Amino acid sequence: PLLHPERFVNLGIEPPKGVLLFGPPGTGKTLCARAVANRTDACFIRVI
Amino acid sequence: IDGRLKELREQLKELTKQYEKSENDLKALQSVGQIVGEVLKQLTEEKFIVKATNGPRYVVGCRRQLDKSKLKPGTRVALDMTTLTIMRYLPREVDPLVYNMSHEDPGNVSYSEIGGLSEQIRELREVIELPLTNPELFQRVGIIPPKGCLLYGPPGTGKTLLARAVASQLDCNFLKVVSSSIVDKYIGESARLIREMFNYARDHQPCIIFMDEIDAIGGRRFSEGTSADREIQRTLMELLNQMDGFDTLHRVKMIMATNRPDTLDPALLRPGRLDRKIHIDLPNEQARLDILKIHAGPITKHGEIDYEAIVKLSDGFNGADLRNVCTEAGMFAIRADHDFVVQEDFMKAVRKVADSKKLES
Amino acid sequence: KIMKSEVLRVTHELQAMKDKIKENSEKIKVNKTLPYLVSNVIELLDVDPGKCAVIKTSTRQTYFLPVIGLVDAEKLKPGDLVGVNKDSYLILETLPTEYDSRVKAMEVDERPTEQYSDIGGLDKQIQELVEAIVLPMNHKEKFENLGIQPPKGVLMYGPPGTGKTLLARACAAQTKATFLKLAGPQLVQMFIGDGAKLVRDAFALAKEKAPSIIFIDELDAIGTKRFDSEKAGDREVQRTMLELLNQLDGFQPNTQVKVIAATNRVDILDPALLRSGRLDRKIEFPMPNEEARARIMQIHSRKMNVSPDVNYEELARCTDDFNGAQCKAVCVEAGMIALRELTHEDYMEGILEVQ
Numbered sequence: 001p002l003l004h005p006e007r008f009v010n011l012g013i014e015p016p017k018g019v020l021l022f023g024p025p026g027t028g029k030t031l032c033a034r035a036v037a038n039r040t041d042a043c044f045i046r047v048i
Numbered sequence: 049i050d051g052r053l054k055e056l057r058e059q060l061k062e063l064t065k066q067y068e069k070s071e072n073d074l075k076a077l078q079s080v081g082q083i084v085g086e087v088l089k090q091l092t093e094e095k096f097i098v099k100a101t102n103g104p105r106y107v108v109g110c111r112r113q114l115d116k117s118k119l120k121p122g123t124r125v126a127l128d129m130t131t132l133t134i135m136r137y138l139p140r141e142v143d144p145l146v147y148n149m150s151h152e153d154p155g156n157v158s159y160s161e162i163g164g165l166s167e168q169i170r171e172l173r174e175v176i177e178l179p180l181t182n183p184e185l186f187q188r189v190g191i192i193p194p195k196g197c198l199l200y201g202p203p204g205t206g207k208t209l210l211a212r213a214v215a216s217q218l219d220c221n222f223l224k225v226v227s228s229s230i231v232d233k234y235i236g237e238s239a240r241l242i243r244e245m246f247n248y249a250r251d252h253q254p255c256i257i258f259m260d261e262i263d264a265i266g267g268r269r270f271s272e273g274t275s276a277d278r279e280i281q282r283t284l285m286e287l288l289n290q291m292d293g294f295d296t297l298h299r300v301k302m303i304m305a306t307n308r309p310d311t312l313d314p315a316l317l318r319p320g321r322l323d324r325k326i327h328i329d330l331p332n333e334q335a336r337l338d339i340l341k342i343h344a345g346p347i348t349k350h351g352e353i354d355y356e357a358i359v360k361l362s363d364g365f366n367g368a369d370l371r372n373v374c375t376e377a378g379m380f381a382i383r384a385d386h387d388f389v390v391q392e393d394f395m396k397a398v399r400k401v402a403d404s405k406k407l408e409s
Numbered sequence: 410k411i412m413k414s415e416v417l418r419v420t421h422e423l424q425a426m427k428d429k430i431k432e433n434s435e436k437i438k439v440n441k442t443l444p445y446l447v448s449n450v451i452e453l454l455d456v457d458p459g460k461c462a463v464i465k466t467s468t469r470q471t472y473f474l475p476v477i478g479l480v481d482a483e484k485l486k487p488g489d490l491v492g493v494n495k496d497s498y499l500i501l502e503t504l505p506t507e508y509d510s511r512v513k514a515m516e517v518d519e520r521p522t523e524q525y526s527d528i529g530g531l532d533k534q535i536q537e538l539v540e541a542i543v544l545p546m547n548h549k550e551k552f553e554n555l556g557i558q559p560p561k562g563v564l565m566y567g568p569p570g571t572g573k574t575l576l577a578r579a580c581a582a583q584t585k586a587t588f589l590k591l592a593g594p595q596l597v598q599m600f601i602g603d604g605a606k607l608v609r610d611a612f613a614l615a616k617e618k619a620p621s622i623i624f625i626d627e628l629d630a631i632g633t634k635r636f637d638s639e640k641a642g643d644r645e646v647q648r649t650m651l652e653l654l655n656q657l658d659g660f661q662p663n664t665q666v667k668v669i670a671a672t673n674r675v676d677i678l679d680p681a682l683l684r685s686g687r688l689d690r691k692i693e694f695p696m697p698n699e700e701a702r703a704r705i706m707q708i709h710s711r712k713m714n715v716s717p718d719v720n721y722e723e724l725a726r727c728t729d730d731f732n733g734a735q736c737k738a739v740c741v742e743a744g745m746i747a748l749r750e751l752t753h754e755d756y757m758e759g760i761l762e763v764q
C-alpha cells in the first residue's frame with residue numbers, strides 16, 4: 001500500500017484493512033521497524 | 049377610491065404598533081435587575097442581614113413599600129445591585145426532577161374517544177370519583193374510601209385509555225407506573241420506590257396511579273405463582289398498608305390494570321384490599337363498531353359507513369388492533385398514493401391484520 | 410380622503426420606529442455579541458402587581474432580571490445556555506444548549522452516502538420499512554392530509570450481517586434528514602441515570618435536528634425479557650428502558666424523528682416496548698438464500714474488475730448459511746488475494762479464516 005502500485009484497480013479498491021503482527025516476546029515489531037526503514041519518511045511511532 | 053384601503057392600512061398600523069409597544073417595553077426597561085439573596089438575619093427593624101447565595105452578607109436597609117412581616121427571616125429577597133438594599137422578596141422552590149409525574153390532566157377528552165363500554169367507564173367513575181372529589185366526608189362519618197379498581201382484558205380495550213379518560217371528571221394526573229419499575233431489586237426494601245412515587249402523588253395531590261402490568265402476562269408464560277414467588281405480592285402488600293397514607297387528606301387512588309385477573313393473589317381482593325374489580329374483555333360487536341366509528345372519525349374520505357361488514361370480518365379484535373386497522377387502511381391508500389379510501393381499503397386492512405394475528409397466534 | 414395624511418403618518422411612523430428598533434437592537438446586540446454568563450433559569454412567574462427570571466452567572470452569582478426584559482418565556486423555558494447581558498444582567502437571546510458531553514457527537518454522522526442499490530436480498534422487507542419510514546419523511550404531508558399518523562418504532566430483528574445498519578443509513582440518506590446512531594451495548598454505564606441522560610439528550614438532539622433517524626443498536630442488550638434470576642435481574646437498565654419508553658411518545662405530533670432498533674432475536678424483549686405507538690414494525694432479517702448471497706457479493710465486488718465472467722454459482726453453492734457481512738468478507742478476501750483463485754475459487758477461505 002505504501003508503494004501504491006496496484007491497490008486501486010486490480011485488487012479491490014483499498015488494500016487489506018489491517019495487519020496484526022503478534023507473537024510471543026521476540027521478533028514482534030522488528031519487522032515493523034524494517035518496514036518503516038524500507039518505506040518512505042512516513043515513519044512509525046512506538047506507542048504503549 | 050384610495051380611502052377604501054384605509055382598513056388595510058389600519059391593519060398594518062395595528063400590526064406594527066404591537067411590535068412598537070413591544071420594543072418600547074423592551075427598551076424602556078433596560079434594567080440591570082436585582083441580585084438574589086436570603087434573609088440571614090433580620091437584626092432590627094431598620095438594618096437587616098441579607099446574604100447573597102454565593103458568599104457575602106451585608107447589613108442593608110429594606111424596601112420602603114415592604115414591611116418586616118412581608119420580609120421575615122430566612123426568605124428569599126432581592127437586593128439592589130449597586131446601593132445594596134432590599135428591593136423585593138421572592139418565593140423559592142426545590143425540585144427533585146427525577147422519576148416525577150410524566151402524564152398530567154390535560155388531554156383528558158378521551159371520554160368520547162373510548163367509545164366502547166361507556167357503561168363500564170361510568171361504573172368505574174362512580175366507584176372512583178366521589179372519594180377522590182370529597183374524601184373529607186369519609187373521615188367525617190368514619191368510613192374508609194376505596195383504594196382503586198382492577199381491570200381485565202389483557203390485549204383488549206384500552207385500560208390505559210380508560211385511565212386517561214376517566215380522569216376527565218377527576219381533574220387528576222394519571223401516572224403510568226410499571227410493577228417491575230416499582231419493585232426494582234428483589235428485596236422488601238422495594239417499598240422505597242413506592243414511597244418516592246407516593247410522595248410524588250402527594251406533591252401532585254390530585255393523582256391516580258395507573259399500574260401497567262402486575263400479573264405479568266396473565267394469558268401465558270410466568271404468572272404470580274411461577275417465577276418470582278411472592279415478591280410481587282409482598283410489594284403489593286406494601287401499597288396495601290399504604291392505605292393509611294392519609295386517604296382523607298390525599299387525593300390519590302391506584303388503578304390496577306392487570307392482563308388477566310386469574311393469578312392476582314386472592315389475598316389482595318378482601319375488603320381493605322384493592323376491593324373493586326370492573327370487568328373488561330374484548331369488545332362486543334356494538335363496542336367494536338363504535339370504536340371503528342371513532343377510529344374512522346379523523347379519517348375523511350369517500351368510503352362508506354358499512355361498519356357492520358367490517359365488524360363481521362374483524363370480530364374479536366382489540367381496540368388497539370382496530371386503531372392499527374385504520375392506520376393500515378391509511379397505509380394502503382398512501383402506498384397506492386391514492387387520496388381516496390374506500391371500503392375495499394378497509395377490507396384489505398382487516399384481512400391483513402386478521403392474517404397477521406392469526407399467524408402470530 | 411384622510412388616507413393621504415394617514416399614510417403620510419403611517420409610512421413615517423413605521424420606518425422611524427423600525428429604525429428605533431434597529432438602534433435598540435444594535436445597542437443590545439453588541440452586548441448580545443458579548444454574552445458571558447450561563448442562564449440557569451430558576452423560573453419564577455412573577456406577574457407584575459408577568460414573569461421573571463433568576464440567572465446563575467458563570468461567575469457564581471444570581472441576577473434577577475425583572476420580567477425577562479428582552480425575550481419571551483414561551484421560547485425561554487427553565488434550562489440553560491441562553492444569552493445573558495454581561496453589563497445589563499438581563500436575558501439577551503437564546504442560543505443552542507449543550508448535548509450532554511457524550512451526546513454532543515457520540516457517533517453522529519452528518520450525512521450517510523450509502524445507497525439502497527448496494528444492499529438487497531430482503532427487498533420486500535426493505536421496501537416495507539421504506540414505506541413505513543422514508544415515505545413518512547418525504548411524503549409526510551401525504552400522511553398529514555390522510556389523517557393517519559405514521560408509526561415510528563421499527564424493530565429489525567435478525568442475525569448479524571443481515572444489513573440492518575446499511576439499510577438504516579441508506580434510508581436516512583433517502584430521507585435526506587438527520588441521522589443519529591446509538592451504540593446500544595455501551596449504554597450500560599455505572600453512573601446513576603447516565604443512560605437515562607444519554608437517551609434524553611439523544612432525543613433532544615434528534616428533535617432539534619430535523620425529522621431524524623434514531624438508530625438504536627442492540628435492542629436485546631437494552632431490554633431483557635424479565636427473566637429475573639439470582640445472578641442478576643436487569644435492575645438498573647430498567648431505568649434506561651423506561652426512559653426510552655417515555656421518550657418514544659415525545660414526537661407523536663408532527664410525527665418526525667423515527668426510531669429504528671436493530672437486534673438479532675426479538676423474543677428477548679418484554680411485551681412492553683411492543684405497542685402501536687411504540688415499537689410496532691417488527692421486521693425479520695434472515696440469512697440470504699444462495700441467490701441473494703450471490704447477488705449481494707456480486708454487488709459488493711462490482712467495484713472490482715479483475716476476473717471477468719464469474720457467475721458466482723459455485724460461490725452460491727458454497728455460501729451455506731452466510732450473512733451479507735460474510736459475503737462481503739468473502740468477496741474482499743478475493744479483493745485481497747487477487748493480485749498478480751481469481752475466478753470462482755478465491756472465495757471459500759474467507760469464512761474458514763474467521764474460525
Ligand SMILES: Nc1ncnc2c1ncn2[C@@H]1O[C@H](COP(=O)(O)OP(=O)(O)OP(=O)(O)O)[C@@H](O)[C@H]1O
Nearest residue numbers: 021022023024025026027028029030031032033046
Ligand atoms: N528476527 C530477528 N533478527 C534479529 N534480531 C531479532 C529478531 N527478532 C528479535 N530480535 C531482537 O530482539 C530484540 C527485540 O526485538 P523486537 O523489537 O522485535 O521486540 P520487542 O519490541 O522488544 O518486543 P517482543 O519481543 O515482545 O516482540 C532486539 O534486540 C532484536 O535485535
Ligand SMILES: Nc1ncnc2c1ncn2[C@@H]1O[C@H](COP(=O)(O)OP(=O)(O)O)[C@@H](O)[C@H]1O
Nearest residue numbers: 162164202203204205206207208209339367368
Ligand atoms: N375502545 C377503544 N377506543 C379507542 N381506542 C382504543 C380502544 N381500546 C384500545 N384502544 C387503543 O389501544 C391503544 C392502547 O390500548 P391498551 O391500553 O394497551 O389496551 P390493553 O391494555 O387492553 O392492551 C390506545 O392507543 C388506544 O387508542
Ligand SMILES: Nc1ncnc2c1ncn2[C@@H]1O[C@H](COP(=O)(O)OP(=O)(O)O)[C@@H](O)[C@H]1O
Nearest residue numbers: 527528529568569570571572573574733734737
Ligand atoms: N444486502 C447487503 N449488501 C451489501 N452488504 C451487506 C448486506 N447485508 C450485510 N452487508 C454487510 O454487512 C455489514 C453490516 O453488518 P451488520 O450491520 O452488523 O449486520 P446486522 O445489521 O444484520 O447486524 C456491512 O459491512 C455490509 O458490508
